[PDB]
Structure formats: C-alpha cells, structure tokens
Assembly symmetry: D2
Homo-oligomer: 377 residues x 4
C-alpha cells in the first residue's frame, strides 16, 4: 500500500536546490554577492557567452509546458502538469546531471507561448518543450528552434522519433529485409507520427503509408486530412497511391508503427501482413494490440511503450543524451545530431527479437547518445 | 586573497539542484514518474491548491529581473543580471531555506514583462522582482501583486522601505520625539524613495518632505514632477507647501533620508536642521554625506547603506523573513504584513546610536520577521 | 498513512553526502586532489589546528553507539542502532546544520570503546555518544571528555538532564514555589542537576526501592550509592508508592494515581490524562508536553564545537535557562516544541557565550 | 593565481551531508525518528542484512588511514591525511556515487588499527584502506579482508596492481611479444610493487625480476631482503637467478615497472634493454626517468603516474568500479573480481603507443569495471 500520492506528499516535491558552500559569512557574501558579484555582472553584460563560465547556465534546462497534452490525460492544464514536469526534472538530473527546472505556463495561445519562452533565453542553457498539444506544438517547436540560440527539444516529437527509428533499424536488420523495399504503416499522425514518418523517409524507407482516424492519407480523397500537416504527409507518402482504412493499409505491410489508440489492430490482420511482420504498438497507455495476442497471431517482433513488456520504445533513451550534448554544443539541434542519436541507440545493443533496443537503465546508452550528439554537426 | 571572478569560474554557478533519493530504479520511477505521477497530475488539475502539498511550489520563488537596474551598474541587461540573481537565489536558500531560481528576461517593455510573469504563476509559490528600473517597476509591482495570487515582492521598493522604517522608528525612540510632530526629508524619489514616503505616512508621520533632482516636490511647481509618480508623491506630501532645493528642505528638519547620489548634503546644512538630527545617507556606493563628517558637523545618528560603518540599513534583514512568511500564507503581501516586519526588525535589538538595527547575520531577526509576517495574514 | 519501514525502504537511508561542485574536470582534481591537495596535507600535518580551516572537521560530529541501550528497546546491538543513529544525524543537520555521521561499533567492552573513540579524534570536531548503557557510560563519558581535545557529549546523560531541568523550572514557576525514578544514564544526571539548581528534597528510586545508604539492597552500583548520599532528606525508605506519597514532583526514566508528572520512559510509566493530576510530560512526539533531547543537543553541540572547548557545567546550565526562557509556560506547554527554530538558536547562542 | 589552499579554505571542506526532505515537521520526525524508527531498529537487530534495505549502509564506504604513507609525503599522520581522505571521498561520490566518509585514525600499531576497523563493520558497506605504510599494510589488508564481511580494498596495493596490469597487457600486445617469454623488471617492492609482482605472475609472466634499495631480490644475497615480504618475493621471482643492481636487472629486459624513486633510471640503460622496451615509471611525484628523456633514449612506450603526460597509470580508473561492484555484491573481494577489472580496463580502449589505457574521465571505464566486478566470483 505504497502510493505515488503518499510519497509525493511526504517528499513535498522532487525538486531541491542546494548550496555550493555550507558556512555563509561576511567573506562569502562579499564574493558571491555584493560587492564581488558586480565584476561578474560587468563581465556577463560585456559578453553574454561568459554566462556559460560564471553561472549555472551551462547546465540548466527549462522544462516547458502549458499542460495541453499531459501524459495520456490530455489538456488538464499547468497545475496538473507541474508534478509531471517535476518528474521530468528529476530524470534530467538523474540520467544526465542536468539542472532542470519546471516552467509550467498558464498561457496556451501559440504566439504567446512562443514569445514567453523566447524571453527566458538568458536564464537557461536549453529548452525542453513537453506535453504541448498538436498541432500547435509543430509551430512552437519550429519557431523557437529557429529563433533562439539555445537548443530547443520537444520529447514527444523528436525523442519518440529518435527511439522509434533506432528500434525500427534493428528490427529491420533482424527481418533481413532491404530498407528501400519494405512497406511501413504508420498510424496516428499527431506529434510523434508526423516526426516518425519524416525520420523513416530520411533514413531510406520509400514506402511509408500514413494513416489517421479517417484512413490512409491520400491527396485524392482528402477527407483523409484533419490538418495541413497531414496534407504535407500525403505529399511524400504512399507511393502505390493506396486508399482505405488501416486494415487495407496492412495488407502486405512489413511493419506497423502505431502511436495512436488502444486495441484497434485486430489479430487476424497480422496474418494478412507480410512474412515476419513487425508490430510497434506504442499507444499509451493501452497498446494498439495486446502484445501476447500479437505474438500468438504471428508477429515476429512486438514492441510497445510500456515497461510491462519487452522492447519498450521509450523517450528516456534519447532525451538525456541529446539534451546534454546540445546544451554543451550551445547550438541548434540539427538533423545530423538527431540521426547520430538514432545510430548510437541502435548500436548500443546486439539486437534480438526480444531485445531490439537497450533498456533506459543501461547507462552506456546515455553516454553514447551524449557523445554522438556532442560530436555532430 | 581570492577573486570573485575566479571563484565563480570554479563554482560554475552558485545554483545546484539535488534529488530526494540516491538510487533510481524501476520502482522509484513508477512512483515519481509514470505511471504513479498521473494520480498526482489528476489531483492537481482537479485542485490547483494541491500543488502546495505534492510539489515544491510551497517553497519555490522566482527571482525575476530584466536587468534594467542592476546593483549600482544600471541597465546592463539580463545576462549581466544572471550572476546577481544567482547570488540572490543563494541568499534565499541560505537565510530562509527557500528554493529560489533566477528568471532573467530578455524583455523590458512593462506590459510584456507583466504578462510573462503572470504566466509563471503555476510554477512558483512567490515572485521576487529584483533590479527592475523606475518608474516602470512601480506599475509592474502594483499590477502583479493585484492580479496574481501568489505574493510578489520587489526588494528595492518594499525591502528598503521596511528596513528604513524599522531604522527610523528606533532612531525616533532614541531621539524622544513624537511621530506626528517630526519633519522628515526624503531625498531621491525612485524605487526606494517612493515607497519610503508611503511607509512613513502609513506609520503616522505628517510632515514628510520629498525632494528629487529638480527640488522639493510641490504640485504647484510642476518642474519638480519628473513623472506621474512624483506628482502622486507631491500630492500626499509637503503639508507646509515648501518650495526650493534640498538645502531649503532641511531647515528645521529632524530626519534626512537619502536614497540618491554621493556627497550632496553639505556639512554646514546639518547645523540648520533641528536639534539631535538624524541622517540616513543610503546612496550606494558613496553616501550623500561622509558619515564621520556628519558626526563632526553635529549629527545625532548616522546610518548608511555600507558595511563599512555602523547602522547598515540593508534589505537582507527583510526579504528572507517576509518572503518565507508570505509564501507560506499563500496570500498577497499586505500593508499589515509589511508593518509587522518593520516592528519585528525594530524590536530585534536594544537601540543605541551606534546600533539602531540588528546586523543581518543575527538569525533571530529572520525568525522574528518570518513569525510576524506569518501571523498577520 | 505511510509506514516508518516503508519510507526507510524507499529512502534507502536518511544520510546523503554531496559535492561542492557539479562539474569535475582535470582542473578541479588538480585542486581538490593531487597535486594541490599535497599543500593542504603539509599544512595540516605541520599544524593540526588547520584542519578546522581546510577540512569539514569544524562541523563534523560522530554519533557513537554500541547499541547497548537503544531507545526503549535495550541492548539490541550496533545494527539495530544504525537506523536510529541515522535519525540522530538527520536531526543534527536539520536543527544545527552539523554534518553528523553514525559510528555504530561492534565492540562493547568499555576500555575498548574508549580507545576506539579516542583514535577517531582527527576525523571529527565533536563526539556525540548515544544509546550506551549505564553504568559503563559514566566512565566512558568522563574518560573521553577528560582525554580528548574535542567536545564529547552523551545525550541521555547531559541532554536529558538539560531538557528535564528546563521543564522542571517552568513547571515549578506554574506551581508557584521531588521524586526521580530510574537512576540510569538520565536519572543520575537529572538528580545532580536538580541539586545544582537548588532542590533540597530529591528522592531517588530504582528497581529495588528508594535509594538510602542504610538499606544496602537499594545500591545496585557505586553510582546509586553516590546518589543515596546526596539524596533523601527525611531519610525515608521503601518502594515507589511510599516513595511518591504526597509528592512535590514525579520524574521517571521508567516503565498508582491516588498519590507535576514527567513520565518520560519510552512507551510510558504507571490516565496520562483523565486520572486528574496537574502537568503531564511524555517522551513521545505524540502527546502534549514532550520532554525530548532534541531541544538540547543541536544547539549544545553547535556551540561547543565552535568554541572548541570541553563542555562545562556552565554551558549546560546556559542551555537549561535558554530552553526554559524559550516560551511562556502554561500547564499544557511548559517548554517549546522541537521544530520551533528559535529554541535551537537560543541554545546555540547561550552555549557559545558561556564557553 | 588560484590556489589549492585558497580553494580549500573557501569550501571549508569537500564533504557535505544532505537531507532527503526539506521541511521537517512533527509527521516527518514521527517517521524518521521516534516512534517510527523503533520498528526499523527492531527489524535490523532481528536481521542485520536489513541494514542494506533500511539505511545508507548499502552505499557507504569508510576511507581509512593513519597517515603513515600519504601521497608522496610519507608518514605525516592523520591530520595531514584528512584533507587527502576528503579528496578521495569526493572522488568516490563523483565517479561512483558512493557516499564515502574519511576515517583518519590517531593509532598506528597494526593490531590496534585492525581491531578499530573491525569494530566499524556495522556502520559501512565497504572499507577503503588508504595511505597506510608497508609492510604493516600487508597484514592489515589480509586480516581485515579475511575477518570482515564487507569488502576491504587498499588502493595502493590492489588498485595500483589492477591498473598496472591492464596497462602491461595492452603494452605487451603492442609489443607483439609472448607473456611467458618477456623479462619484466619491477623496482620498489612496497605496497604496490609486491602486488604488481604477484599479478604479473598470475597473469602468466615467468621472468619477473624484483628490485629494491639494496639490489635485485635473491634469497642467496640476504642483504636484499628487507622484510619477510621481500623474502617471499625473492622466492617466486628471478628464475635466471640474477644478482646485482637495477642496471644489471635491466640488461635485455622488455619492461621496467617502477613504483619507487625519482630520476634513478639512467637513459643509456634503455639502450641495453631489449628492442621496443617499455618503461612504466610510476614514482610519485617525480618519475624514475623523465618521460621525454626516455623516449629520446629509445623507449617504445612510456607511462607514468602523472596527468602531465600520456599513459597515466592511475588508481582512479580502478577503485570506483571495484568498490561499487564489491559493495553491491557484499562479499569479499576475490582474485577473479580483480582480474575482471584488469581485463575491463584493458579492453576499454584500442591501445596505441601514446594511449595504452583510457583516461579516468572516460566514464565508460567506470561502468565497465563496475559491471565486470559485479559479475564475477
């Protein structure tokens, strides 16, 4: 009977601050505050880059949310978001030694978020956008990364894409199929899906069939398009010009990657997919199909977003290293950096069907991602 | 002999974060992050007050500046401000065990600042405005404290006024004069001066005479009104309707409180003030008159802003206790609470001419301030 | 309603260490380890006092126990004592900012304990003996405090006596002007404080009755003999009931109603309310009027370590007075609670000032 | 001009403690102290292994010295040792997250040290003996590791031997010679030398030649045997039954390993060693021969104990992982565990002449050593 609530109540928060020194005397204050701190102020005004030498800015990250898409719970707001962003901050400290600080905003208009986060630049070495709904989060990420001079990263977009891509590459190796030749069905084209399709295409997949809640995205019957972003996905997708529902998409498919809803992939559809079919059922918290059921129906490899099962595709393998690398580099996160991360995660294990990527507590992963990202232009 | 710069470089910042637990395993994450943290999110969304029980909000404070008036250096900006705000955060932790975090903004238009800070409400239990220039900081303070539901406190305004008030009360006790009957000259109607005038009035002084760089403030010599705030001060000031320069003001005055520029009060003017005259010459870093010189010219009590001399009037006596009390009470900071603090500081020692207030390393002071503020809320 | 065990399990201890710096690079190591640290070594070897300037010694305290008298549980040993010493260390940091560290020893012969603790002198600025049984703890305290040159303090003797004395003085004030039961570590020292304070009729009682040199059965060691010699005015004698009959005060380190009550045994002695009777003090962090060491040790240790001298009668009585003056006594609150920070500041100030 | 002394003074120590929780109230005490702690006390008395579950014992280590052999300084005592043991503790935390405490003893008779440290067993998960002179440290290590049920490790003996061994294996590989055929001269048979000899023999070296102040160790020249431990070494070394000084020993030698004094190996001797000679000159702080001088005289590979030069053979690569592994395993440190560490360090890089082992800041090493040690007998 050890409750998450009980333990939060007892800890009164997961976020501590802490002093460099124990004793605080006249001399200490004259150094760390007035009058000595004036010199450090003069220095940082004359040259902002010197904040990276004389303050904590070289290692501080803002975890920014308006709570418009918290976990699986939806748009619950900044107050609901706060304990979740404290948890992320805790993870940042524990897995990367990054001093992360939750910034939960009571503003949800795009343009306003964007100008608020821009204003924080002097205070942080990096920005981690988290649990901000789609499609606004597409514009918010693009704008802030383009206009800020510290790295800006959105887990549910770039993190998921990185880890899905590394899993995909290893499953594909096990499958023994050519990347240019496989048919990959991606279902659920919100933040993750949009970015997954883009990774898959950069990597070499040529036949990506995208699907969302009114079917396969197709210019020619464009009832298939909630958003402009789905427009963009059909322009670069579905080479065979297929049309119909998920079930139709899966005919002959080699991979299904779902970042969508629970229990929607029926088991008999697996038998209409190609031989040695791979199923990434990452809907949170209930996967698109139950993993055992999928195994029983013939799946070669099954992955989910849960720690309950083997082959957990989890953002945690990505964000510590990426953020650490990017913040040290001090520049914009680039495609090359994200693909270095993909490759690092992938090579961080010898793939087997029951283990196509490492687990997050394997500290070598975080090291290798860090290194990969630090080293890339 | 150690440099402020060298030690900052070595420390790479004065701000740490730190974790509740050492070991981080599957179980710990299931409690402090997913899935357990979803319960906590649901509870805080349902009732935002619960952030005070389940997160660090009960003890976190944002130290907010745009760097428009840093220490004695002026409008150097948010980067120069950062190491200073780090210093302030250090002090909050050391003297009140408050987890303070610097928020240095690259926005300096007053309406934009206001709206940025408002949006941060969910992430903090209190706001400490710091080193924001006058006159914009008057409106900023007023608006944020009226519109936010966590306390907002600006040191240079409210802290200085609190300490100056407590100093004034004790000095007045030692002088043996009636508050209704004394003439008090306040010179320099900026951040501090403005607020010092208002406190003195709230306290019961009747003859306050305000002075700035174009002379005594009087509604009928409109030259003397450099903004709307000076006009406001002129309208609640100067009962005898006096007109002229600082020298004229001081004729018969009992107190001079200067928060202005260096070596401005000529020693011979002291002899034209009333008997047992009191001189708070708080201009930083050079006082309005040299303290020994003022003693020599007949000053009964002399106080400055420096540690160099007896009677250091410094904000540090005020902000720890006030902020701790206010965040705990969760309410807006009120005239009551500020006056509690004044009285608690004043009663924190037995006044004599060379010691009219306590030193800031006397930890009884911070406890008494804290207790006073907690109790009037 | 979270369990003490479950939370100890989740915390995996109440003791952390922590680094001054975050980033650790070639430069940092060259300053804090080799080769820079050799200069600091040379300096401390040439002058041991410099450990107070260059190391954490100025603020570290060893919390020493063999587990021979743990809380109310008895001689459970060093392993049972460990989570308790961890608690005491936690309190030391919380209430005095002292970096305390548990030293639970698997040795219980007194001369060996004494020489082990002596050998630790270079590593600490102070020693807090804790939960070591009587009567060996009387010799252990005296020897270590006489032979070491850092302060050594034993809670259950000096801390309990301080707090009991402050409680007593305030209770006496409310009374508008004394039986001590259980003459172990605490009782012994409680008796002597009450005498130093001015009480004339102290009556000491232990498991064989009221201590009277003329009834030799009542003298379980030399120390009870000593107490019998400076206690009991109407040279009276018998068990407790006779001991307590029409009684100024009852003070117990212990385990009928009819005859001010500090009953301070772990769990209880002897209605602790609704059986009448004016003032009622527990040991518990549970009920009104808790007489606990916590009010004393933080401040006393902080003061003593800073003054660097041996703890004296004067310093302990400072503490007694500072705790007693730390509130306005009313029957339901004859002393402050431990989380009133003012108390620890006042104790610290008092002890510093009498050093 | 930034001094080690100045910085130590400013930090007033490198050791902090820190609390799990920030606020302390009635409820907290009732859980972490009386009366709740009594249940934890009962549990640990009933079963001492439960200290690993309910206290910090699972992760605390005593750093034990009497200061009989501090750094390169000698027998300076426990006060001189203290700032050094604080440094070691700081390393333990930084590289392994181990909570290490300095225990510097004012007792230096060996039996007395032994009984003191045994008495501390309930308070620690592990013992790190440090800077205790030879030959008493031989008996001290052996007795404590035999008699205690927490691991006991002495750096200068076991750590130095582990790192020297890995360096040796990699150097040997680069050399392309067979381990059973090389002549290896070890000079300075103190805490390190004794153990280095024994590891090399375990590893497969057959011609090890031990040398100390009175010459090559040889039972037949009894002068050469300064204690029983040198006699022991003489009996398992020097198969060719050589006799004479270091210079004689080096004729035809393939490796020199010195853990002795500065500037004793003359450059021209290198030319009488075999082809592609390897020189580990680890005397601290001045090497047995200047490294450049050695290169200039024909050395194929040169290593020292300093960070000043390539190929730093330093204990830091070994102790964090070893201690962490051992303390978690809870059992006695074994020969298999130490050889796993040797292998793990060696494989943690691709050896080249200018880099035969990794540097300590390569965090992969510490992970690999930890894994190796945790996994072995």
């Amino acid at each position: 009977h050890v409750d998450a609530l009980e333990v939060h109540r007892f800890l009164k928060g997961k976020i501590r601050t802490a002093l460099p020194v124990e004793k605080v005397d006249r001399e200490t204050l004259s150094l760390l505050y007035t009058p000595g701190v004036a010199d450090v102020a003069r220095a940082c005004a004359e040259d902002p880059e010197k904040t990276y030498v004389y303050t904590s800015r070289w290692n501080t990250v803002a975890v920014v949310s308006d709570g418009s898409a918290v976990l699986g719970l939806g748009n619950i707001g900044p107050y609901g978001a706060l304990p979740v962003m404290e948890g992320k901050a805790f993870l940042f400290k524990a897995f990367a030694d990054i001093d992360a600080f939750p910034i939960c905003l009571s503003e949800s208009e795009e343009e306003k978020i964007i100008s608020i986060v821009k204003s924080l630049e002097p205070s942080f070495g990096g920005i981690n956008l988290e649990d901000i709904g789609a499609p606004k989060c597409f514009r918010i990420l693009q704008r802030l990364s383009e206009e800020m001079n510290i790295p800006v990263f959105h887990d549910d977009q770039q993190g998921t894409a990185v880890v899905v891509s590394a899993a995909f590459l290893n499953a594909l190796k096990l499958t023994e199929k050519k990347i240019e030749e496989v048919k990959v069905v991606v279902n659920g084209i919100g933040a993750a899906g949009y970015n997954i399709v883009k990774f898959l295409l950069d990597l070499g997949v040529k036949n990506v069939v995208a699907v969302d809640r009114k079917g396969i995205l197709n210019e020619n019957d464009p009832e298939t398009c909630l958003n402009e972003y789905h427009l963009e996905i059909a322009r670069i997708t579905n080479p065979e010009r297929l049309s119909g529902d998920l079930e139709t998409a899966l005919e002959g498919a080699d991979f299904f990657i779902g970042v969508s809803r629970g229990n929607i992939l029926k088991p008999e559809w697996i038998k209409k997919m190609s031989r040695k079919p791979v199923i990434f059922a990452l809907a949170n918290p209930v996967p698109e199909i139950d993993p055992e059921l999928a195994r029983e129906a013939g799946a070669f490899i099954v992955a989910t977003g849960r720690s309950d099962h083997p082959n957990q595709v989890n953002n945690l393998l990505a964000f510590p290293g990426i953020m650490k690398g990017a913040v040290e580099k001090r520049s914009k996160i680039t495609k090359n950096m994200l693909l270095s991360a993909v490759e690092a995660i992938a090579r961080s294990c010898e793939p087997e069907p029951e283990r196509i990527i490492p687990e997050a507590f394997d500290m070598k992963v975080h090291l290798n991602v860090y290194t990969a990202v630090k080293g890339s232009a």
